[PDB]
Amino acid sequence: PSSLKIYFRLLGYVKPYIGMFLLSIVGFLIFASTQPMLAGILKYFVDGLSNHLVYAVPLLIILIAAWQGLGSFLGNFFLAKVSLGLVHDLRVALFNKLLVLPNRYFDTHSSGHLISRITFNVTMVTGAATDAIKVVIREGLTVVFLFLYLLWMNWKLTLVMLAILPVIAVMVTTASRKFRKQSKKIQVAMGDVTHVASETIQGYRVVRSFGGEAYEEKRFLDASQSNTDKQLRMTKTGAVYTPMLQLVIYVAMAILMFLVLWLRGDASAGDLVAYITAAGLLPKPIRQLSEVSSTVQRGVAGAESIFEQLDEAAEEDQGTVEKERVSGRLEVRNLSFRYPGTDKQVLDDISFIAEPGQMIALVGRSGSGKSTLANLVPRFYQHNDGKILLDGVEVEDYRLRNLRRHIALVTQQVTLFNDSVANNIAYGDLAGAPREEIERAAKAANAKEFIDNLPQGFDTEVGENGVLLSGGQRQRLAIARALLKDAPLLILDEATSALDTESERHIQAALDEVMKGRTTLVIAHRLSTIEKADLILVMDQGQIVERGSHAELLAQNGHYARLHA
Amino acid sequence: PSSLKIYFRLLGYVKPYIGMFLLSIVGFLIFASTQPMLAGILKYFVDGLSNHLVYAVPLLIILIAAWQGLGSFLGNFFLAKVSLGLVHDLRVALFNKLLVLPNRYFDTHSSGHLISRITFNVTMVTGAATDAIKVVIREGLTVVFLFLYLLWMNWKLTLVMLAILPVIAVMVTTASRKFRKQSKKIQVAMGDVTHVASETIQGYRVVRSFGGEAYEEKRFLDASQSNTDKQLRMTKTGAVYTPMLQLVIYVAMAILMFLVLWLRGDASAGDLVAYITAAGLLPKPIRQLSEVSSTVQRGVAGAESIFEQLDEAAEEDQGTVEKERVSGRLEVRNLSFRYPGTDKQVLDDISFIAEPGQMIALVGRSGSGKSTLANLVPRFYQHNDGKILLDGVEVEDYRLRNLRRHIALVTQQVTLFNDSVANNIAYGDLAGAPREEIERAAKAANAKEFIDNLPQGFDTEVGENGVLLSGGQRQRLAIARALLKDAPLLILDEATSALDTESERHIQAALDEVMKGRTTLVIAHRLSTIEKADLILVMDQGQIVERGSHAELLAQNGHYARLHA
Ligand SMILES: CCCCCCCCCCCCO[C@@H]1O[C@H](CO)[C@@H](O[C@H]2O[C@H](CO)[C@@H](O)[C@H](O)[C@H]2O)[C@H](O)[C@H]1O
Ligand SMILES: CCCCCCCCCCCCO[C@@H]1O[C@H](CO)[C@@H](O[C@H]2O[C@H](CO)[C@@H](O)[C@H](O)[C@H]2O)[C@H](O)[C@H]1O
Ligand SMILES: [Zn+2]
Ligand SMILES: [Zn+2]
Ligand SMILES: [Zn+2]
Ligand SMILES: [Zn+2]
């Protein structure tokens, strides 16, 4: 959008700190007004020395010095509260937006891009909102006052200095366009540097195993070189732009001098001398304005990237139905789905009904769409064709927070936080549960045995993503996390992929006790864990080719019979 | 260590940019010397107006303006070059260290801390290395010259101004200590904020499924509030620190004034007046020095944080043996291992020999230590008790780069990069392989069928960590990546956990053709894929309880018989 629209929207975040901003200006006025007083009283003491009591002058120095210090403290301290408060408000707004963005947003964006926006882009708007305003108001008023002051003595001579106003306006406009474009390139380049570093840290084991240290070094060297080159190009533009405006001023002054010499007749000192002296006070304010033009555009480009994320569309939440507890009946009716931005159809026509106290088993080859179907019930991705009804109400009529409270999920990709074992099991809505409840859930997931052997028991830290645990132990913590949540609907997405047969039997036996009070949807590749399911759905290329029980599907010679053995 | 040592070590990175620093100083000297010339020529032109040709003054104005612009451009551009070069060198040094740090370093540190160190801590050293030096040199020389001038005029009066030096020194020392501590706290807080943001971004699905948006919001709010409070505390400390030094200076000046009045006898103007005038030039340099101490200490803290990582111990690389190709014989002899910082024993006594063209199967319950045993061959973790020999040479005698070239690894946790399928399959040492080789490798891993159906074929982007693919497809891509590398030794760590029976059969059939020319170590929980292994090792609680073939282990009634059915 327009650069003025972005800047005015940025100033809306400085409104709560208007009172603190005025104190900073008042404090700096006290500091500035002291300098003439100290110098003036210094001269009086000196003059008295050469020549009705001056013995009070030494005492007055301390008072004015203390008065100067109070003004300096107010200016510096209360200006930081405006700058730090503005940055803090933007960071909180950016992070709270991350918790409502759709899943498809995180799939098409790197983590380094998002981290850099909250860390680096926010600091780029500090100067444009605090220091830039003071300079523009102060030096801007000085230039306007001087031009009115010059017009008073001689309007004919001011026409020469007015003729260079258009050329400065064109030059300032052209330079501002470059600064905004160059700042946008710099923030993207900084995001690329963070993206390379984040990717290498996440996959250091792949880099360490298959070689590629030379490949990773070159990739980061190019990313860092571009960031340095683009930052250096901005400085070169700024370092030529400021001196070039000064040369325009002095060229105009040179033309003014020639006219005065030719116009020296019919006049004398006191009128032409005053005009030349006044005209010489213009270069200094213009230099200050030039050096702040880069800062303003740097903030404008930074705020544009910040406001792009804040204006991004969140997941649809137009529902209003809230229920304390649902029966758990799940029904899918003629559902078809394709991922956004993709023309491939993942699900063609799905129809099944799950009654309370039942298991529905989802089996098939890899890539059939079993995880996609289970990811539409919690409304991770929006569906357009078909209906998904939970307890007779379409899942789009529930509120998002209320809908996800009734569904317990065990994803295929197990993710854990860098915290204690007890904190990982009781996370979010179930946080603060009694330790007895946590241990009961862990016992059901066959996880109490290895937890008790940890150095600190349930308080042991698992490290980053649970790296300090084996693959099967991480997965059993994810199962325990979902069992504590209870919920009428439980979806298991390959919950025993990293477990042996003995651990599977213990978990499968413990899952029969939660059979009666909930509806379970199981996606499994080991068919021995779903042999007691009420309904088994065999899905191939997005269509449920076969359905029935274990005996019915075995008698029929189809995909299930071949997959079973 | 000492702050002086850290600061001197930091200046070692500014040595390559000494010439640019001198050019910047020369340019700024050219800029500074112009102002008196312009003022004097303006005064000369004004005086001639009131009253042997002055018509060249306008041209001299333009010439001097151009000279001033050239000086300003040189100074600004080359100072920016020095700062950007220093930052780039520090970032490149930091990133290259990440590629040699041990696995245990990444296991005990968050990615957010490492990302923040390369991004935020590096920018904290610019001022202390570029702007601090000029101010310190200039104002220190000014203060020393002023003190010598005062001592020349009257040494008796200078004793009063000498008596305030110790209090200033003590005050500056205390302020510097506080500044260093506060800078360390601030950078730690920024690392915490980055860690919270990265953790929330990485595990957004868990946050979205189990609730906890309020929990994450509160955690990030606390982190940001702590960071803001610490920065505000530093600002308050500095803003109280400077005016207090000014007040000390002015108290000393008041005492001097009181002494002068009593000493007015036996003297007159020209000696006492000069002393008072000279003594009044001291507050400004001391004020300039005070405002730069905070920058120096902030840079010192940042440099200390950087040098802590740069001095971290890398993985041991004392070996020297290099081989172009090894036979592939693997032998483990009386190996025992415990993870660093942990008193629990993972492996007790392991002994097995793998001949070329053989399969060794590792089976057992979860947490037995199979991945730990498989992770010692590539020397991911250092072992102390026992010997691991590859082709009759202990694995610690090989160079790390040469040793890992002979081993192809399929880790349990599949990790992919945000790039094309072909780039993921051919990564690192095998980069640049012909497309025919990549397609042949993908065909063996039963991955060509689903790759050919992608929108762009082999050039399709898989997204962050391959999120745009199902788990089985990612695992098959990892298998293809490992198969392309060839290598005499191949280790598979649950390579078929996320695959159905048909894909498992296809991959197992394709793996029999690579049987003859390599030695294969397989860690499997699905025992149907290792029924044709030459040797099967059943490991329980870190000990190989049973060994033999499928028929031998089935005839014996032990752990394998129970695990099989
Ligand atoms: C609504 C906002 C705009 C409306 C009002 C704008 C008018 C601004 C009036 C400010 C006039 C005083 O100008 C002010 O002078 C002091 C020094 O003299 C400067 O202060 C500067 O030098 C001092 C010297 O110690 C430093 O402590 C300080 O860190 C530095 O910023 C301020 O940067 C400047 O802003
Ligand atoms: C080995 C290093 C130390 C040995 C040499 C140290 C002596 C330093 C001599 C420098 C004397 C000139 O001092 C220099 O003046 C100019 C302005 O007058 C300042 O420059 C400052 O104001 C100008 C005004 O346009 C701005 O363009 C510039 O961005 C800003 O930094 C420099 O910050 C200062 O360093
Ligand atoms: Zn992005
Ligand atoms: Zn799946
Ligand atoms: Zn850390
Ligand atoms: Zn394992």
Side-chain angles (χ1 to χ4, degrees), chain A residues 242 287-288 291, chain B residues 18 21-22 24-26 28-32 35 72-73 75-76 79 130-131 133-138 141:
Chain A
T242 302
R287 161 130 47 74
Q288 314 264 83
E291 305 175 341
Chain B
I18 278 190
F21 210 91
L22 299 185
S24 177
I25 293 170
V26 166
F28 275 142
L29 286 186
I30 287 181
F31 173 82
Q35 320 264 58
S72 176
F73 166 80
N76 289 300
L79 186 59
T130 59
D131 279 295
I133 296 181
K134 302 186 306 175
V135 176
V136 162
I137 295 298
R138 195 201 317 130
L141 281 199

Side-chain angles (χ1 to χ4, degrees), chain A residues 88 101 107 199 204 208-209 216 224 315 365-366 413 418 427 474 485 500-501 505 562-563 565, chain B residues 88 101 107 198-199 204 208-209 216 224 315 365-366 413 418 427 474 485 500-501 505 563 565:
Chain A
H88 173 81
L101 288 176
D107 297 358
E199 223 185 9
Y204 72 98
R208 197 180 296 285
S209 314
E216 289 301 307
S224 184
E315 39 193 2
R365 326 264 312 277
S366 312
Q413 270 247 297
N418 193 1
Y427 177 83
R474 302 198 325 127
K485 179 163 184 173
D500 46 304
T501 50
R505 289 182 214 115
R562 162 159 52 259
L563 280 169
Chain B
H88 173 81
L101 289 176
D107 293 357
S198 317
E199 221 188 9
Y204 72 97
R208 198 181 296 284
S209 314
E216 296 301 307
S224 186
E315 39 193 2
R365 326 264 312 277
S366 312
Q413 269 246 304
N418 193 0
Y427 177 83
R474 306 195 324 129
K485 179 163 184 173
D500 46 304
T501 50
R505 288 183 215 114
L563 281 168

Side-chain angles (χ1 to χ4, degrees), chain A residues 297-325:
Chain A
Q297 292 307 303
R298 173 183 173 75
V300 166
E304 183 177 358
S305 71
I306 292 178
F307 295 152
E308 205 193 7
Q309 208 206 254
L310 298 184
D311 293 356
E312 188 87 8
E315 39 193 2
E316 218 215 353
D317 208 315
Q318 318 296 347
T320 50
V321 173
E322 301 186 5
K323 295 184 177 182
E324 198 74 13
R325 186 109 175 154

Side-chain angles (χ1 to χ4, degrees), chain B residues 247-542:
Chain B
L247 189 52
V248 171
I249 295 311
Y250 279 104
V251 163
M253 278 210 30
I255 281 176
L256 185 70
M257 294 194 185
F258 267 136
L259 286 182
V260 168
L261 289 175
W262 163 91
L263 194 125
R264 179 161 20 81
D266 202 58
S268 188
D271 172 54
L272 300 182
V273 188
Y275 196 93
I276 293 294
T277 306
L281 306 177
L282 276 172
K284 212 205 92 203
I286 301 189
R287 161 132 50 74
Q288 305 265 85
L289 286 174
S290 298
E291 313 191 311
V292 88
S293 181
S294 176
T295 300
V296 171
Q297 292 311 302
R298 172 186 176 78
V300 163
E304 181 180 358
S305 71
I306 293 177
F307 297 152
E308 199 197 14
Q309 161 158 350
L310 289 186
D311 291 356
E312 188 86 8
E315 39 193 2
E316 218 215 353
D317 208 315
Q318 318 297 348
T320 51
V321 173
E322 301 186 5
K323 295 184 177 182
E324 198 74 13
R325 186 109 175 154
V326 302
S327 184
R329 168 163 177 171
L330 184 65
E331 151 150 47
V332 172
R333 195 180 312 172
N334 301 300
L335 176 63
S336 321
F337 173 78
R338 60 154 53 74
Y339 280 93
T342 290
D343 317 337
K344 194 183 107 63
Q345 273 243 300
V346 195
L347 306 165
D348 209 297
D349 196 293
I350 327 284
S351 291
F352 69 93
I353 304 178
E355 276 108 337
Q358 284 211 140
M359 286 182 39
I360 313 297
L362 253 187
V363 293
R365 326 264 312 277
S366 312
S368 317
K370 306 179 298 292
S371 308
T372 284
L373 178 56
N375 282 357
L376 294 185
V377 185
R379 286 187 52 190
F380 285 157
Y381 298 93
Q382 302 307 304
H383 78 278
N384 301 122
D385 190 9
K387 304 236 287 294
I388 307 180
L389 302 95
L390 175 58
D391 227 326
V393 176
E394 226 255 338
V395 298
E396 293 171 352
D397 299 359
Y398 288 86
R399 325 252 325 132
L400 265 187
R401 299 259 200 293
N402 189 242
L403 169 71
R404 287 162 176 166
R405 186 62 191 74
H406 306 318
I407 306 176
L409 241 190
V410 181
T411 37
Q412 156 147 241
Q413 269 246 304
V414 175
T415 297
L416 303 171
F417 298 97
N418 193 0
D419 207 356
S420 64
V421 171
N423 285 355
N424 272 300
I425 292 185
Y427 177 83
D429 277 340
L430 262 305
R435 184 53 68 78
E436 188 270 351
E437 265 213 289
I438 296 185
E439 292 188 359
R440 207 217 334 290
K443 168 127 181 33
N446 202 63
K448 197 176 188 305
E449 204 84 339
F450 85 87
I451 286 171
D452 268 341
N453 296 358
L454 289 177
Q456 283 80 57
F458 275 84
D459 307 300
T460 309
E461 313 257 327
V462 298
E464 273 262 300
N465 204 0
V467 62
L468 304 187
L469 297 175
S470 37
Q473 296 175 358
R474 306 195 324 129
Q475 198 171 64
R476 269 175 292 182
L477 283 195
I479 297 176
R481 191 215 297 129
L483 287 185
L484 181 59
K485 179 163 184 173
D486 259 10
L489 183 61
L490 174 73
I491 294 148
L492 303 157
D493 203 13
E494 282 185 273
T496 43
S497 61
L499 298 179
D500 46 304
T501 50
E502 298 221 31
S503 305
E504 276 183 38
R505 288 183 215 114
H506 278 85
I507 292 193
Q508 189 199 346
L511 278 183
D512 292 1
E513 298 319 88
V514 316
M515 216 71 115
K516 279 74 208 170
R518 76 193 62 257
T519 313
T520 306
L521 184 64
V522 181
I523 292 100
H525 275 312
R526 316 193 184 190
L527 308 192
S528 84
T529 69
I530 59 130
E531 286 186 356
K532 288 166 39 133
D534 304 10
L535 187 67
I536 309 181
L537 305 169
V538 191
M539 170 157 84
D540 181 37
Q541 272 145 27

